[model samples]
Target: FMKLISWNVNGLRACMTKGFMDFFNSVDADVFCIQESKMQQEQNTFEFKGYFDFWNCAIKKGYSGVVTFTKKEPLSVSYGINMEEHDKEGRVITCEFESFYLVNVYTPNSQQALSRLSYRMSWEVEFKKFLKALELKKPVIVCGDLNVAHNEIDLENPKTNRKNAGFSDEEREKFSELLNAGFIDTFRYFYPNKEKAYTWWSYMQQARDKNIGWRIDYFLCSNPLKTRLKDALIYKDILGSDHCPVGLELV
Candidate 1:
């Protein structure tokens, strides 16, 4: 069995001070991926005992970044989508293993007032193409903070958030297209009608406590690997950032 975990730590250094290491050491995942690290490689120090680490940090001083740690060494690793405009934020990291390609991504938020919605549309097109190209090689396991709640059931008060940054109609449609192409949303696939199983919440109004949140984080896998899936989980009780850890187990 293989256990994979993904989380948007918000800021790695800040999370570390908030019991990040304690949770990290306890999960014992085979492959652990993180998004929104918010720091460059030189800005943080991590000494994980038995794992190999890989990072793709934004060129900006402190901003969007991603990192992955694995107990099993990967065959190869690639950073970003190779497009200057999209790659500048260091939002993607891909690692190739024997049976599948693992991709961790920190999708850009559309921002308040939909300021970046136009750019996000273009990104959706290119990013989906990138995943398809990798799919041709092997089954792919894509995970991270996708930044959108794909459907109404994915969040509490969907009616109220219809036009919010993460719940905009455009972003939701793009996410649907990705799943329609040939992937299974592991969590939803396992619990098709489950409600309130969210991965992210706002820091305001005690949202997490009230269970008012969005299932913006995901673990999507190429359909071929569907039968091997054992479990999909949301670790909401294990908190550090506004987002919680999500897990995927496969045989």
Candidate 2:
């Protein structure tokens, strides 16, 4: 069996002090994908016992970034979505393994009052195309903070956050397309009607304490790999950041 973990640590630097490595060491995953690393090359000095780390740090410095740590080295590795416009933020990292391609991404937030909605819309289109193209060669396992709640059931206060950045209809519609592309959301696939199983929580007003959160982080795999999908898990309690870690077990 192979165990994989995905997390949006919010900021790696801050998370480290918040017990990131202790949790990292405990899980002992085969592959770990992290988003919102928010660190530059200079600050990335932590070492995992038996893993190779691949990083894509934002040119803007400590902004949006990602890293993938795998116990087994990949056959190949690539950065970004292969587009200059979208690549600058260091939001993507693709690792080619024998069985599948693993992609870790930190999607850009639309921001307050839908300030970047248009950009977000364009991002969805291009990103979907990128994944489709990758599927031509091999199945893909995608993970990260997708930055959307996906569906009403994905968030605790869906009605109140209807048009908000992470829960907006526009974002959800685009996320819908990704699911429609024969990509099974591993968690929802396993727990179709499960409620309040959220991965992210707002820091304001003790939202997490009240269990008011959103399942914005996820693990997705192509349709054909359904048989290997052993289990999907959300480590909602063991948190070092606003978002907790999610896991997938493949056998």
Candidate 3:
């Protein structure tokens, strides 16, 4: 059995202050993934005794980034989709294992005014192509803060949030295109009708307390590994970051 844990730690150093190491030591996951480290490669030091660490830091300091600590060293590794513009932010890291490739991505947000929506849409196209190319080699496991709530059931008051950053129609369509390309949203696959299931909560005014949040984080994989999926979990009670951890167990 292999357990993979992914979380948008908000900031690695901040999370460390909140006992991230305690939880890390106790969980003993085969692969631990973190998004939005918001730091440069030299800014922070994280040492997990038994895992091999991989990091993708953005060009700009304290911005989008991703890291993966894995027990099994990958057969090969690649960063980004070979798109210079997109790769600059260090939003993606792909580790090629013997039987499959594990990809961790911290997708770009459209921001409150939808300023980056066009660029984000273009990224979706490239990302979909990247996944397809990997699937040709081996099955793939893609996880992280996808930055979009794919459906009405994914967020509270979907009607009011129609034009919001994470719930906008444009973002939802991008997510749909991914599923259309033969990938499965693991959590929703197991718990199809589970409603109000969220991983990200706004820090403003009791949003997290009331469960008014978005299920933006995900564990998506190619069709072949669907049967290996043993469990999908949302660590809603974990409170160190604006986003909680979501995990997958594979056999």
Candidate 4:
């Protein structure tokens, strides 16, 4: 019945200089969730018309942030997972709708050097528990830059990047657990055999131009909601940040 869109804008302030407004206006999503906002709402003077928006900024400025802008106000909204350690980073926003709980997140990266791998594992455990708790109450629609490539087909160089941050076996395995918990990774659910349909690409080496990317952004819903799933999309060409927008529509 409504369209929801998720994106990792990298830096909201910087993205505004590079067509953020244009894309934001054109999409007209019923719910627009942005990860890596990297700035507080008060930091910018730009205006967003026709929405009830919520902002969660990390205490450390320019670090991590997420904003949920909805065409209609949600019944209730929360900033994080209710854990002090994880909540400080401003990584999650849960909005309660009439039919579902919309959870948007910007998952922590395991770092290129794998320094944060252990912490990431802990996060996965708590995060999984949180989602399951919500599913018990209502169907959950999860969306954002989840920071993992669940399959070889999800990345351009999966073989070379097997142990990489987003493609590591450990990270992928956690994602598998999430799916098995009764959520459908809508993109793959629709195109199980699709390849090179990525949502994120690095700026180095002209990756976007070459389409060398990873399908990390996603729209996942509880399996019970699949019957209402209308369509899933990747706006691969809408460029304002490293990650393009991904969307889901419900009938």
Off by over 4 Å in 3: none
Which tens-of-lDDT digit does each residue in 62-165 have in candidate 4? 98799999988899998889899989898999999989999999999999877899999999999999999998889999999999998889989988998789
Candidate 3's clash total is 0
Cα lDDT for residue 13, model 4?
A: 86
On lDDT, the stronger of 1 and 2 is 1
Q: How does each model score on TM-score? A: 0.98, 0.98, 0.98, 0.98
Scored by Cα lDDT, where does model 4 land? 0.92
lDDT, candidate 1, 71-110, per-residue tens: 9999999999878889999899999999999999999999
- Runs with alpha carbons beyond 4 Å of true place in candidate 1: none
Minimum summed lDDT over a 10-residue window in model 1 is located at 40-49
- Cα error of candidate 4 at position 193, Å: 1.3
Per-residue accuracy of model 3 over 1-251 as CA lDDT, tens digit each: 99999999998889889978887888899999999888876766777999988889988888888999999988888999998988999799999998889999999999988889999999999999999998888999999999999988898889998888988889999899899999999999999899989999887799999998989999999998998899898989887899999999999
What are the lDDT figures for the candidates, one per model? 0.92, 0.91, 0.91, 0.92
What tens-digit string does per-residue lDDT give for candidate 2 at 94-161? 99999899989888999999899999999999999999999999999999989999878899988899
Question: Roughly what TM-score does model 2 have, to 2 decimal places?
Answer: 0.98
Please provide the root mean square deviation of candidate 4 (C-alpha atoms, Å): 0.9
Clashes of 2: 0
